[PDB]
């Protein structure tokens, strides 16, 4: 029935927009409109009404109000966050279980001289008729008690729980209904990089938000077609895809996205900090991208220009796929015919080059080339070969050989991505599964207790 809905603020929030409602952590509010990213609410205190970020609130006393609970985070991301600098031995998080829907799992930071810093995962079994336990020995009535216990001596766990994984306050969502924005709302500051169809600049939106802005040269794309495609792009929200905030619809077209501190994966890998990334880390980067592509696969979209130059790296080293789908609206006569020095021939599937048959399978081929760029620290594909020679060689059966520092198992995946018949290439869902669990040899990744 029309029951009043109440929520509690998970963080403080300062109004920056006109109809914004400011609140401090803990305050409770009534939900008036549940319009996606922003909700219209009412303060039980000042009785004032305004719009609030939907990700800043949650049901009262819900599980998301606890410091030790991490909602909607996968096993792999739980590992990446716990391993991030700032955490310590015993750092943990209780999260929703991916393996056993409805149940929970505990992730704990560990360490041994052989593997170094690692993250161990334990299944928390939910007993019918109340109860929680990792060990049928130490049972508890609530997750909080489970934490308090293991927070006092490991009692079997690989480690003694210390403190919750470090997390930074979620960034404010983009202004409500600010999809098509006036060019003057942006202040372009410094040039971040160039491109064949546009440049990328660092900028500030309405003096309050730092963003990256890609500027497309006039005539580089159909304005009407771009807009239609951008309306699909913006809906592809995932941790492994760069967020697309807004666009300026008049030429020169502007595509506003979140800013990624470490640039493209390509530049990052060729840099100093990049050269120091161990093979296991490079594989994890590959798994992250595959994860992003599996999302694109699920949503029936296509990247069309997948390559290391189009993967961005955040300050915490998280990969974000960029430019997905943009290639479809480029006008350039040569580019449209998959010809010329502007077209990504070396990364493109034979059927896409020959008949313009772009599908999620042509992206799989591209991912294979991307895998090679990654394992070689950004080296150019088919070194020394020209586009005509590559096209000819591939038709002959040629495939780039396996580099010295590239494990055979990783190379085998590349080879499957480069099958001439698109239907014989694996899905990104499969590729992600193989890369997420590429290591820790044997395993059923779920430390059993004890
Ligand atoms: C639509 C779109 C918009 C911007 C970018 C982008 N390109 N680049 C470079 C190339 C400089 C690394 C970036 N560097 C930091 N942050 C970014 N967001 C970008 C990519 C795609």
Swiss-Prot record:
The active site is at residue 305. The keyword Cytoplasm applies. Subject to autoinhibition, mediated by intramolecular interactions involving the SH2 and SH3 domains. Kinase activity is also regulated by phosphorylation at regulatory tyrosine residues. Phosphorylation at Tyr-335 is required for optimal activity. Phosphorylation at Tyr-446 inhibits kinase activity. Inhibited by PP1 and A-770041. Induction: Up-regulated during myeloid cell differentiation. The highest levels are detected in fully differentiated phagocytes. Up-regulated by IL2. Residues 68-165 form the SH2 domain. Keywords: ATP-binding, Cell junction, Cell membrane, Cell projection, Cytoplasm, Cytoplasmic vesicle, Cytoskeleton, Exocytosis, Golgi apparatus, Host-virus interaction, Immunity, Inflammatory response, Innate immunity, Kinase, Lipoprotein, Lysosome, Membrane, Myristate, Nucleotide-binding, Nucleus, Palmitate, Phagocytosis, Phosphoprotein, Proto-oncogene, SH2 domain, SH3 domain, Transferase, Tyrosine-protein kinase, Ubl conjugation. Its EC number is 2.7.10.2. Changing residue 305 to E: Loss of kinase activity. The modification Phosphoserine is found at residue 386. The modification Phosphothreonine is found at residue 126. It is an enzyme of class 2 (transferase). One of its GO terms (molecular function) is signaling receptor binding. Belongs to the protein kinase superfamily. Tyr protein kinase family. SRC subfamily. Interacts (via SH2 domain) with FLT3 (tyrosine phosphorylated). Interacts with VAV1, WAS and RAPGEF1. This interaction stimulates its tyrosine-kinase activity. Interacts with ARRB1 and ARRB2. Interacts with ADAM15. Interacts with FASLG. Interacts with CBL. Interacts with FCGR1A; the interaction may be indirect. Interacts with IL6ST. Interacts (via SH3 domain) with ELMO1. Interacts (via SH3 domain) with TP73. Interacts with YAP1. Interacts with ABL1 and ITGB1, and thereby recruits ABL1 to activated ITGB1. Interacts (via SH3 domain) with WDCP. It is linked to Aberrant activation of HCK by HIV-1 protein Nef enhances HIV-1 replication and contributes to HIV-1 pathogenicity. Non-receptor tyrosine-protein kinase found in hematopoietic cells that transmits signals from cell surface receptors and plays an important role in the regulation of innate immune responses, including neutrophil, monocyte, macrophage and mast cell functions, phagocytosis, cell survival and proliferation, cell adhesion and migration. Acts downstream of receptors that bind the Fc region of immunoglobulins, such as FCGR1A and FCGR2A, but also CSF3R, PLAUR, the receptors for IFNG, IL2, IL6 and IL8, and integrins, such as ITGB1 and ITGB2. This is Tyrosine-protein kinase HCK. It comes from Homo sapiens (Human).
């Amino acid at each position: 029935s029309g029951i009043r809905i109440i929520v509690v603020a998970l963080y403080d929030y300062e109004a920056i927009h006109h109809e914004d409602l400011s609140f401090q952590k803990g305050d409770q509010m009534v939900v008036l409109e549940e319009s996606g990213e922003w909700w219209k609410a009412r303060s039980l205190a000042t009785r004032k009404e305004g719009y609030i970020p939907s990700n800043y609130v949650a049901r009262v006393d819900s599980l998301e109000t606890e410091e030790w609970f991490f909602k909607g985070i996968s096993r792999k991301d739980a590992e990446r966050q716990l391993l991030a600098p700032g955490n310590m031995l015993g750092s943990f998080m209780i999260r929703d279980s991916e393996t056993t829907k409805g149940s929970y799992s505990l992730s704990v930071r560990d360490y041994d001289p052989r593997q170094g810093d690692t993250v161990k995962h334990y299944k928390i079994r939910t007993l019918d008729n109340g109860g929680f336990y990792i060990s049928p020995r130490s049972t508890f009535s609530t997750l909080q008690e489970l934490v308090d216990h293991y927070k006092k001596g490991n009692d079997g766990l690989c480690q003694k729980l210390s403190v919750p994984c470090m997390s930074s306050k979620p960034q404010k969502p983009w202004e409500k209904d600010a999809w098509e924005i006036p060019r003057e709302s942006l202040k372009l500051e410094k040039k971040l990089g160039a491109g064949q169809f546009g440049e990328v600049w660092m900028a500030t939106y309405n003096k309050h938000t730092k963003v990256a802005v890609k500027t497309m040269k006039p005539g580089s794309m159909s304005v009407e077609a771009f807009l239609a495609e951008a309306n699909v792009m913006k809906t592809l929200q995932h941790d492994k895809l760069v967020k697309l905030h807004a666009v300026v619809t008049k030429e020169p077209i502007y595509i506003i996205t979140e800013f990624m501190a470490k640039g493209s994966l390509l530049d990052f890998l060729k840099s100093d900090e990049g050269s120091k990334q161990p093979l296991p880390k490079l594989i994890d980067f590959s798994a992250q991208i595959a994860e992003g592509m599996a999302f694109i696969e699920q949503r029936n979209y296509i990247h069309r220009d997948l390559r290391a130059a189009n993967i961005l790296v955040s300050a915490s080293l998280v990969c974000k796929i960029a430019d997905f789908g943009l290639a479809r609206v480029i006008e350039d006569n040569e580019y449209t015919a998959r010809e010329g020095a502007k077209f990504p021939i070396k990364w493109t599937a034979p059927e896409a080059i020959n008949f313009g048959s772009f599908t999620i399978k042509s992206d799989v081929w591209s991912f294979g080339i991307l895998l090679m760029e990654i394992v070689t620290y950004g080296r150019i594909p088919y070194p020394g070969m020209s586009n005509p020679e590559v096209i000819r060689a591939l038709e002959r059966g040629y495939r780039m050989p396996r580099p010295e520092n590239c494990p055979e198992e990783l190379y085998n995946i590349m080879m499957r991505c480069w099958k001439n018949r698109p239907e014989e290439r694996p899905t990104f869902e499969y590729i992600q599964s193989v890369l997420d669990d590429f290591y820790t040899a044997t395993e059923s990744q779920y430390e059993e207790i004890p």
